[PDB]
């Protein structure tokens, strides 16, 4: 998606 983390 956009960037790993959220999620």
């Amino acid at each position: 998606g956009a960037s790993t983390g959220s999620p």
Partner: antibody
Amino acid sequence: QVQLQQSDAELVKPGASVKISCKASGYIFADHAIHWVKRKPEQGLEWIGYISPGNDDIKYNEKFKGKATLTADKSSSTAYMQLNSLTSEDSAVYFCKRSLPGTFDYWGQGTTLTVSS
Amino acid sequence: DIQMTQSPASLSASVGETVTITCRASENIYSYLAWYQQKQGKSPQLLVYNAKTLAEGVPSRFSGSGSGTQFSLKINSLQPEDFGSYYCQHHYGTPYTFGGGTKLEIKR
């Protein structure tokens, strides 16, 4: 070739501050967040925060908000964690680790912080 | 701010048995659950990410399962080298909380 270099040991007086270094090599520093994890005997593992150097995104566990301060020197590809107002409770092994659980998961050796006169 | 509950706290089992370690989340975390092995003096070793996906180099007798709030790590054909502490950690969002850990002893 991936490495996260941490000193084995830090010794610091109660009430003082310490800046634990995590020196990354073998990959582009800006590609991955660096997470900090506390391992204290009989307190299992505890996530402290991450600094994502690529995008200046810093996130803290609320418990460590005033306690911990994360920074990165992009030029020497080193993540720093500073603990403030140290007590015997802060004595522990502090790991730096790359990325989230996944293909990029990688751990430093851990820095044994002893808070003592 | 999701509570992660691990069980059992501690566990004894023989070589060749299957151990089942449980991790239960207070909220839905979808697939975003990891398992780590720790032995004393050593960095945590990632066993499983995204509930079911084995990390490079982990023996195939390790398998993670689950989704939502209900997760499990199974070690099939337990080996003497499997002794140590096992921690779940979610990677859903900050804070990335750990369960309390399971200490696994090999009976002999």
